[PDB]
A and B are shown apart, each in its own frame.
Chain A
Amino acid sequence: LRNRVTDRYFRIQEVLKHARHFRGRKNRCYRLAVRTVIRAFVKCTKARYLKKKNMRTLWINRITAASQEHGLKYPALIGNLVKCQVELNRKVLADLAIYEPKTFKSLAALASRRRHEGFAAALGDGKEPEGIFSRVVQYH
């Protein structure tokens, strides 16, 4: 043979390195390994999207849990915060719920107040003062 591959072992090893910790022949035999390793890689790429979703769901669950301890539902809370112009993201809100509970409680209270104000507004179709924690800071 003119030129045949001297370096093939190394190629084999490249894939088997990523397959070391699989069960059974998937970690020993290159043919089986390759399919598995590729699949794993694919999963990893896909999983990035999944991870983000999962985290946000977890945060929502946590915030919901926290909110129920103060007699409020998640959606009400979030909406009232949005109305207030307090734009804390849900990671941060979850952190607050866990690590800084008095602040969380305060936030909940604020939300409740906002809700109440909204309700009040709904009764009297128009006027007068709009309420104290309502209103919006106008940027120009």
Chain B
Amino acid sequence: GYVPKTSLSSPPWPEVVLPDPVEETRHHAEVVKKVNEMIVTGQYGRLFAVVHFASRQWKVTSEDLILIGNELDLACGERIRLEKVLLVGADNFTLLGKPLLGKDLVRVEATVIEKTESWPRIIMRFRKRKNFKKKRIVTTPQTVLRINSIEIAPCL
């Protein structure tokens, strides 16, 4: 089952040889340990998180504002722990869940600043030659969250 060197004997692509799983595992463990150490030391500087709120995914940091188009039914100034941090990253290392990270690992805090209505949004139907002409004005309710803090723990 041999073929001499031609354009279609071997693949166009290069052959990758993936490493031994035991060694690989060890390497992974080592990497994890390093990360843990870093976390312990406070060697990081500012984190970010891709959090899941209201079916949307948001890359978020301490001090930023996020506008969610609906009522949360919270008084303003109340503090919230956002679950579903499916990415948490920084300079020098990042952590992604499968898909969500655990609650022990990370937590994101958010203060509700304001609850509002959107500017009036105009719905309006029309059809040619057929006396069909509708017009509905709407104001979708909104909330403004200020993400205060991303705490990250040495659980790894």
Contact = CB atoms under 8 A, between A and B. Distances in A.
Interface of A: 38-39, 41-42, 44-45, 84-89, 91-92, 95-96, 99-100, 102-103, 106-107, 116-117, 119-120, 129, 131-132, 136-137
A86 B59 contact: no
Contacts, number: 68
- Which applies to chain B's interface (DSSP): helix, strand, loop or mixed? strand
Nearest to A116: B16
Contacts of A120: 18
10 contacts: A45-B123, A86-B98, A87-B99, A88-B96, A95-B59, A100-B59, A100-B89, A117-B18, A132-B24, A132-B28
A106 B88 CA distance: 13
Nearest to B27: A132
B99 A86 contact: yes
A38 B98 contact: no
Nearest to B48: A100
A84 B59 contact: no
A41 B134 CA distance: 10
Interface string B85-122: 01101010010101100000000000000000000001
B124 interface: yes
Given A45-B122, A92-B58, 9 more contacts: A38-B124, A41-B122, A41-B135, A45-B123, A84-B98, A91-B56, A92-B50, A102-B94, A107-B96
A86 B122 contact: no
